[PDB]
Design an enzyme around this catalytic site. Structure first.
Site, PDB file in Angstrom:
ATOM      1  N   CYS A 124      43.889  43.576  41.912  1.00 46.77           N
ATOM      2  CA  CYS A 124      42.888  44.389  42.683  1.00 46.77           C
ATOM      3  C   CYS A 124      43.702  44.381  43.989  1.00 46.77           C
ATOM      4  O   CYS A 124      45.091  44.649  44.120  1.00 46.77           O
ATOM      5  CB  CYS A 124      41.625  43.969  43.090  1.00 46.77           C
ATOM      6  SG  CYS A 124      41.156  42.322  43.227  1.00 46.77           S
ATOM      7  N   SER A 125      43.240  43.856  45.073  1.00 47.81           N
ATOM      8  CA  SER A 125      43.901  43.805  46.628  1.00 47.81           C
ATOM      9  C   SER A 125      44.445  42.337  46.246  1.00 47.81           C
ATOM     10  O   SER A 125      45.844  41.891  46.154  1.00 47.81           O
ATOM     11  CB  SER A 125      42.942  43.991  47.873  1.00 47.81           C
ATOM     12  OG  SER A 125      41.784  43.097  47.460  1.00 47.81           O
ATOM     13  N   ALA A 126      43.425  41.310  46.691  1.00 45.32           N
ATOM     14  CA  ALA A 126      43.868  40.043  46.549  1.00 45.32           C
ATOM     15  C   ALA A 126      43.895  39.186  45.400  1.00 45.32           C
ATOM     16  O   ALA A 126      44.699  37.876  45.194  1.00 45.32           O
ATOM     17  CB  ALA A 126      43.167  39.137  47.658  1.00 45.32           C
ATOM     18  N   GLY A 127      43.552  39.885  44.160  1.00 46.13           N
ATOM     19  CA  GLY A 127      43.498  39.469  42.993  1.00 46.13           C
ATOM     20  C   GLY A 127      42.436  38.506  42.716  1.00 46.13           C
ATOM     21  O   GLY A 127      42.707  37.558  41.806  1.00 46.13           O
TER      22      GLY A 127
END
Length: 284
Positions: A221-224
């Protein structure tokens, strides 16, 4: 009872809020190196040392660091292997494709748009007249795409330029996550999960009846950790429900956080996992 138990819980605040964010004695030596600070999208979210994904070192990346974790869970006899990672940065796309190559990845599940509410979540690390782009030593060519509105499946050809070898990689992007909260269309997220299941099966078909290790799928995703955690916890708990495995949702989340810190970042996300499980059971 099982169904009524899940529906009733949806009490979840306290259950979520009580779970530790990370391993108590976590070690993250490589991720903590000043040289690797810029390789993390969110500095505070990093892999533990023992299960970080190790790249073959290069001149520019001497520790072979990427912000990515091996997540491995066994449920009964079944073994699951994910690589949970951040949305690539403009300066880590080549690291990302090196990882996909070295780890034998055939499937990427991207649970985000590139930009949401004017905020960058992931770089565009696959091609947008020319349908190819080269990231470091990897040429990526976009071949076809099916858009299912809630998500889109793109077939990519990835070529390791040094050897000339090629692989098909399937890129499954969920596009229905709103800027705030969680999706209203729970069915669409279940359908996304089904698509992942479908693609994993067909990409692994030639391993059927062998002892060859199934490669990990990449989830980001963004930061995972947030939506990445939602996807992984949902897939695992759906499996547990299908096979009547005695595993509680918060315990499975604890297990995931022992492999990557901060998995599932909001109550809305956590509640959404429950909504997904309830709808799965209703569908059944």
């Amino acid at each position: 009872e099982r169904f009524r138990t899940l529906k009733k819980k949806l009490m979840v605040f306290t259950e979520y809020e009580q779970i530790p964010k990370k391993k108590a004695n976590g070690i993250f030596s490589t991720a903590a190196l000043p040289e690797n600070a810029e390789r993390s999208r969110i500095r505070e979210v990093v892999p533990y040392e023992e299960n970080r994904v190790e790249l073959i070192p290069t001149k520019e990346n001497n520790t072979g660091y990427i912000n990515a974790s091996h997540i491995k869970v066994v449920v009964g006899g079944a073994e699951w292997h994910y690589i949970a990672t951040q949305g690539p940065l403009p300066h880590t796309c080549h690291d990302f494709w090196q990882m996909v190559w070295e780890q034998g990845v055939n499937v990427i599940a991207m649970v985000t748009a590139e930009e949401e509410g004017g905020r960058t979540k992931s770089h565009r690390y696959w091609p947008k007249k020319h349908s190819s782009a080269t990231y470091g030593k990897f040429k990526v060519t976009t071949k076809f795409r099916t858009d299912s509105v809630c998500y889109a499946t793109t077939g990519l050809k990835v070529k390791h330029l040094l050897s000339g070898q090629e692989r098909t990689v399937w890129h499954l992007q969920y596009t229905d996550w709103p800027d705030h909260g969680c999706p209203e269309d729970v069915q669409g997220f279940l359908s996304y999960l089904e698509e992942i299941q479908s693609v994993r099966r067909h990409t692994n078909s030639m391993l059927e009846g062998t002892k060859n290790r199934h490669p990990p799928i990449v989830v980001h995703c963004s930061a995972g950790v947030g939506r990445t955690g939602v996807l992984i916890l949902s897939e695992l708990m759906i499996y547990c429900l299908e096979h009547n495995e005695k595993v509680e949702v918060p315990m499975m989340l604890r297990l995931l956080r022992e492999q990557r810190m901060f998995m599932i970042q909001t109550i809305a996300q956590y509640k959404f996992v429950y909504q997904v499980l309830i709808q799965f059971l209703q569908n059944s």
